């Protein structure tokens, strides 16, 4: 009786004559159920794809091909289940379902006996049952003929616990795979794709208006990945093309945009609604309840993850198919089902998302509830809800509903967009780009302008052209922007790429790629901003042409950018253009050219441009650039000549003897005007350093000097101290952060520090100075004729033996105000003797750094008492120390005291228990001006990192 069943299923499944073929794709399905590896033979195939592609047709064709032949011959029996068309709460069994599918019953008893080896199930849908699972526990069925709700047997057959060693083919959705993948046992995934990219492009091209705006609108549509991706379904592409044709026909009577899916869907639905009206009017009240109920039901289905909408759901919202069809005259909410029960599904999931979004706008129009008797899945509804906020759609809604429409959710959307802008530790680029994409959807100037008013800083990564377009659109309305950073890793790396997408060119004459012109628009927008004054190219790699366009657009007279950074970008090719920008924009005064090698000609041109009367750059950072002898000679002849430069950095590039004598000859001249000079991590020897200081002895223009990470002899320190001794030295800050200063050299420094003004800062980081030199330094600082202000001793070899001396100095000084002790083992007794003199507040110390000082919880009482009554202290560092709960509680109570005025506290608060966390939150609550952050060195009240940028 099997041939009769085969003939019957042939008769039932016959809806496509020219859509059945021995295609290569069917062959991959047929050969899939074969051992790919000799050991492994899969028993479950999961077909997934976009909602609109032909998957159900594919499953029906599978069953048809078995029913006739040429497709499956080993599988003696094939059973097709379609779960969207049946009710799934009643208690049933597998045998009853099969008998419903199989008109005869006497076959199954003999089929079950030995057929489980050779038996295939084809399940269609299985995406609507993602909600019925209680997630608590299911009783797994092991045998059929069991009275139990059908989803339980579906779960059991899914887990190979009901009818094992049988083949399954499952048709599902991309978003219905989250709860499913854990259930199945070693599946094979097949991805179903719709029509290709080129066919989609042609289908979109033939339907555009061609009223002098073909290219811009066409490319806006085609490059949008969100729209183009779901245009894979022939139904969605048909809807898009029909909306475009409709917009072409009623060219003047339409004001809604055609660049977004929201505009096209609004066009279609609103035109169909007004078609009913014999004359222009507002919808009747019953029609209003009908539409609002339909929107609310779609929204509930979206939230609850349902797409079937049984008849009781329709009765819940006082809906009916008759009035819906009469009001719309469109294929919306198609009915499926053949038994007594009936099912209603939207013609597409896109329409359900659109109506769910539309519910949010009409919810506050009236009191609708009197007439009702009752993160990936939410991307579409979110995008549509953002799009619905255009004022033209709202005007049409006001026309239909006869009342003003001001949706409440607009404040919520604007507030969410604003919350991204004000983030304490920079803005996340992903969230910024997501917000920009959402705001591009609502082509409204007022909404977007009100959303972007608190940014003041922006970080963007561009790896698609649509990123360029949405950023260019949104950045025009960020009028408070002051600094931007762009990371374009690969989009503009290659100079030339000439290809055409279709068989023929889209336009008869193009003469320029779309990418280059979109980049030019982006650059012009950057150049037109008024409050922006810092641009960073980040990690971007740029071809000559990209740099040429950027520099040309930055040359315009409305550009007020003052800081330019290239320290992480490959811009070596277009450097020539850069030079032309240097003496054409007079607002630019900071150029960071780190990590880019300079040849002979590039250096010559840069020096020639810097000499120009039209240039105004005063800071030039040139670290990790490999110069030659001629490069240093031309740098020197630039330094002597008339220039506006005041700060120079030559870090991380070796300096020879001849280059050193040339630089010294340039520096010794009285016509050299330079303020700051950074020379760290160079290759200065004791001879080179001696020659440099000998040259500098006659200089009276330099004020800042950094020589860190170098090798200095004791004679070098003596020569530096001699250069400091004479009057008219004008040297204010000195950095020696890694030079080997040992023994008698420190004495020289103390002898210079004891009686000297005009020198306010001194950093001695990472130097082997112990307590012996600390005695001398504290004696030097104790004198009233010492005007030092900041002292840094971060990584010296300091112990507690000097601590009491520090205490005395802390009491006795009158000019020191900042003191950093970074990696010194003071312990607990050293700290207690220090805060013995720190508590009495005899001085005006305002910054103390006590990180990495090996402090346990025994020193907490003294620290708490000292900081409890010391109103002068303003900054404190306490990271990298082991504090118990009780001592830390004592510290927290000390912070809350009404006497202290602490402004910066260096702590990582994620290293303590809950009670400490509550106390710290209360500390932040009582005093609102307290910042508790672990990055203590990012606080820069005065210019302290002037040598590290």
């Amino acid at each position: 009786d099997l041939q009769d069943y085969k003939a019957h299923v042939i008769a039932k499944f016959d809806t496509s004559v020219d859509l059945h073929y021995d295609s290569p794709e069917m062959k991959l399905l047929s050969d899939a159920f074969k051992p790919y590896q000799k050991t492994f033979q899969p028993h479950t195939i999961i077909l997934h794809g976009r909602p609109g592609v032909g998957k159900s047709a594919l499953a029906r064709s599978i069953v048809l091909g078995w029913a006739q032949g040429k497709l499956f011959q080993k599988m003696s029996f094939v059973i097709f289940f379609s779960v969207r068309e049946i009710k799934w709460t009643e208690k049933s069994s597998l045998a009853q379902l099969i008998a419903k599918e199989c008109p005869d019953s006497w076959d199954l008893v003999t089929k079950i006996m030995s057929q489980p080896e050779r038996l295939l199930f084809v399940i269609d849908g299985l995406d609507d049952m993602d909600s019925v699972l209680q997630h608590d526990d299911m009783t797994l069925s092991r045998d059929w003929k069991d009275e139990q709700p059908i989803y339980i047997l579906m779960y059991s057959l899914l887990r190979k616990a009901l009818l094992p060693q049988s083949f399954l083919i499952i048709t599902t959705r991309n978003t219905g795979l989250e709860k499913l993948k854990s259930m199945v046992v070693s599946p094979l995934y097949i991805l179903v794709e719709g029509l290709s990219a080129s066919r989609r492009s042609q289908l979109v091209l033939e339907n555009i208006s061609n009223e002098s705006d073909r290219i811009q609108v066409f490319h806006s549509l085609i490059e949008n990945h969100q729209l183009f991706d779901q245009c894979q379904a022939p139904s969605v592409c048909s809807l898009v093309c029909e909306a475009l044709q409709l917009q072409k026909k009623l060219g003047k009577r339409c004001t809604l945009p055609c660049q977004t899916l929201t505009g096209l869907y609004a066009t279609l639905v609103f035109h169909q609604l007004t078609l009913k009206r014999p004359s222009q009017s507002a919808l009747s009240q019953e029609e209003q309840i009908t539409l609002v109920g339909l929107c609310m039901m779609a929204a509930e289905g979206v939230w609850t993850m349902r797409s079937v909408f049984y008849d009781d759901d329709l009765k819940n919202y006082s809906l009916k198919e008759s009035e819906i069809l009469a009001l719309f005259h469109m294929n919306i909410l198609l009915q499926v089902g053949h038994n007594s029960e009936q099912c209603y599904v939207f013609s597409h999931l896109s329409l359900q998302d659109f109506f769910a979004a539309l519910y949010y706008v009409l919810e506050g129009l009236e009191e609708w509830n009197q007439h009702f008797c009752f993160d990936t899945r939410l991307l579409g509804m979110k995008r549509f809800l953002f799009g619905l906020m255009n004022k033209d759609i709202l005007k049409t809604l006001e026309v239909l509903f006869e009342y003003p429409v001001i949706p409440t959710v607009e404040q919520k959307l604007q507030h969410w967009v604003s919350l991204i802008a004000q983030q304490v530790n920079g803005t996340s680029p992903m969230d910024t780009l997501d917000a920009f994409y959402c705001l591009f959807e609502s082509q409204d100037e007022e909404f977007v302008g009100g959303a972007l008013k608190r940014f003041q800083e922006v970080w963007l990564l561009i790896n698609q052209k649509m990123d360029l377009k949405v950023s260019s659109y949104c950045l025009k309305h960020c009028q408070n922007l002051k600094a931007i950073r762009v990371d374009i890793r690969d989009l503009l790396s290659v100079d030339n790429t000439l290809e055409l997408c279709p068989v023929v060119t889209v336009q008869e004459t193009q003469c320029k790629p779309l990418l280059m012109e979109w980049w030019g628009n982006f650059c012009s927008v950057l150049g037109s901003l008024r409050n922006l004054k810092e641009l960073d190219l980040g990690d971007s790699i740029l071809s000559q042409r990209a740099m040429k366009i950027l520099c040309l657009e930055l040359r315009n007279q409305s550009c007020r950018i003052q800081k330019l950074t290239f320290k992480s970008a490959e811009v070596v090719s277009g450097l020539k253009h850069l030079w032309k920008l240097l003496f054409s924009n007079q607002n630019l005064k900071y150029l960071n050219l780190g990590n880019t090698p300079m040849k002979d000609d590039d250096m010559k041109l840069a020096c020639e441009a810097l000499k120009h009367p039209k240039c105004s750059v005063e800071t030039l950072r040139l670290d990790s650039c490999e110069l030659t002898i001629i490069g240093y000679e031309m740098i020197s002849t630039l330094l002597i000549s008339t220039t506006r430069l005041k700060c120079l950095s030559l870090a991380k590039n070796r300096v020879g003897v001849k280059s050193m004598i040339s630089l010294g000859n340039a520096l010794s001249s009285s016509m050299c005007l330079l303020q700051k000079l950074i020379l760290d991590n160079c290759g200065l020897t004791p001879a080179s350093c001696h020659l440099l200081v000998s040259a500098l002895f006659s200089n009276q223009n330099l004020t800042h000097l950094c020589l860190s990470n170098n090798s200095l002899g004791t004679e070098g320190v003596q020569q530096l101290c001699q250069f400091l001794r004479n009057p008219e030295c004008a040297l204010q800050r000195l950095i020696l952060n890694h030079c080997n200063i040992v023994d008698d050299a420190y004495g020289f420094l103390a002898m210079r520090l004891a009686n000297n003004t005009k020198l306010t800062h001194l950093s001695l980081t990472m130097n082997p100075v112990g307590d012996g030199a600390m005695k001398l330094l504290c004696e030097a600082l104790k004198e009233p004729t010492c005007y030092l202000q900041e002292l840094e001793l971060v990584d010296c070899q300091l112990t507690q033996n000097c601590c009491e001396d520090l205490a005395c100095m802390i009491t006795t000084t009158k000019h020191l105000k900042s003191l950093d002790l970074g990696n010194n083992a003071l312990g607990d007794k050293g700290v207690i003797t220090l805060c013995e003199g720190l508590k009495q507040s005899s001085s005006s110390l305002r910054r103390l750094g006590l990180g990495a000082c090996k402090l346990t919880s025994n020193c907490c009482e003294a620290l708490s008492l000292a900081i409890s009554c010391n109103p002068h202290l303003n900054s404190l560092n306490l990271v990298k120390n082991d504090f118990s709960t009780s001592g830390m509680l004592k510290l927290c109570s000390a912070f809350q005291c009404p006497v202290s005025n602490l402004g910066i506290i260096g702590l990582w608060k994620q290293e303590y228990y809950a009670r400490v966390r509550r106390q710290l939150e209360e500390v932040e609550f009582v005093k609102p001006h307290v910042v508790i952050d672990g990055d203590w060195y990012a606080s820069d009240e005065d210019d302290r990192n002037w040598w590290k940028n």
């Binding site: 854990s182 919520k412 969230d431 991590n681 990271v879």
Partner: protein
């Protein structure tokens, strides 16, 4: 005694907007600044800004960095007592092992709290009652090993195939796995409860050699270029040479060795004892073992940084601590709820997974 209070940690921006839209819907149907953490972008990086430093590093000191803090970004909800954790950032996966199965998770998903694994591999139905004890992941992220108590062998899974399916068996009938290791020469080895370390040829599943020691002496097992370092409850560390196939070294320690690790670049070996004491041993010179720390609680986990400039420790003391390598000075701590039994670190040194009771928390390393 001190009960840490767990809070919903991420509150990302997208979740904030979704939760805002969720409340309005229920508000309508009744009559009848905020701190956001940066997302884990693409499951790879966080796109943040590095902390400031008091000075500039030397020209040759570029890739040698130390962390400063850890930030929690996600919780993976296993539903049983966690035992082992593995990552393999190459493919952006996470493997969590328990006594009843191994759950595979993907890091690409942007969820505050994950409860839906990519796969759930189990073996309990095969025999009457079988427990898992340990799992291992190879260097190139193409093979997974699992071993347990009542298994007939250690199960081998292929991770580079179109499907996730069992591959090998590596027979070992009446032993408890207790340890796993892998070598570059395409060989596998495991160390069971009765002191046997057995080496199989991975491509033919053929036993190559068996090494015998005293009971419970193979709890920890580390492989190097030609040496095998073993240690356990007997409080001795021994080294076997595969060539001459007997013990080479024997060092005695004051307490039971609970964890072992090896520095990727230098020649240092890390010992974690049962009295909280860390120990450093030179694997080449082998002069003397130098103790670096002391604690009140035992140590159950130890792992080196990819550049070998720091290490992390976990134990029964509610804390995950990070120490600097040169001298062993503690860098920072992060608290948890209960005994932390396993943790793992990514290859690029960006993430760290930690399994405390039945949830695996993933932290981002802030440099």
């Amino acid at each position: 005694d001190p009960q840490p209070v767990w809070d919903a940690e991420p509150q990302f921006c997208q979740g904030f907007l979704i939760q805002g839209l969720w409340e309005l819907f229920m508000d309508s149907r009744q009559k009848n600044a905020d701190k956001f953490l940066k997302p884990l972008s693409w499951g790879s990086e966080v796109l943040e800004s590095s902390c400031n430093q008091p000075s500039t590093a030397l020209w040759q000191l570029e890739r040698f960095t130390v962390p400063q803090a850890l930030q929690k970004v996600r919780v993976l909800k296993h539903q049983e007592l966690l035992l082992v954790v593995a990552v393999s950032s190459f493919t952006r996966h996470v493997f969590t092992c328990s006594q009843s199965g191994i759950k595979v998770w993907n890091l690409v998903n942007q969820v505050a709290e994950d409860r839906d694994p990519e796969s759930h591999l189990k073996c309990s139905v095969q025999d009457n009652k079988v427990y898992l004890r340990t799992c291992l992941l190879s260097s190139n992220s193409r093979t997974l090993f699992a071993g347990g108590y009542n298994l007939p062998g250690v199960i081998v899974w292929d991770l580079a195939a179109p499907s996730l399916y069992e591959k090998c068996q590596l027979p070992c009938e009446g032993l408890s796995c207790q340890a796993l290791a892998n070598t570059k020469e395409n060989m596998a080895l495991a160390g069971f409860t009765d002191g046997t370390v057995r080496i199989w040829d991975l491509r033919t599943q053929e036993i190559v050699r068996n090494l015998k020691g005293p009971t419970n002496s193979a709890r920890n097992l580390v492989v190097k270029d030609d040496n095998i370092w073993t240690g356990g409850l007997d409080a001795c560390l021994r080294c076997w040479d595969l060539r001459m196939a007997k013990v080479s070294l024997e060092h005695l320690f004051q307490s039971q060795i609970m964890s072992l690790a090896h520095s990727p670049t230098e020649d240092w070996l890390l010992l974690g004892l049962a009295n909280g004491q860390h120990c450093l041993f030179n694997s080449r010179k082998r002069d003397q073992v130098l103790t670096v720390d002391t604690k009140d609680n035992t140590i159950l986990g130890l792992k080196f940084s990819p550049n070998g400039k720091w290490w992390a420790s976990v134990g029964m003391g509610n804390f995950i601590t990070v120490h600097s390598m040169p001298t062993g000075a503690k860098l920072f701590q992060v608290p948890e709820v209960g005994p932390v039994r396993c943790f793992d670190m990514t290859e690029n040194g960006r993430l760290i997974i930690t399994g405390s009771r039945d949830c695996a928390s993933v932290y981002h390393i802030k440099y």
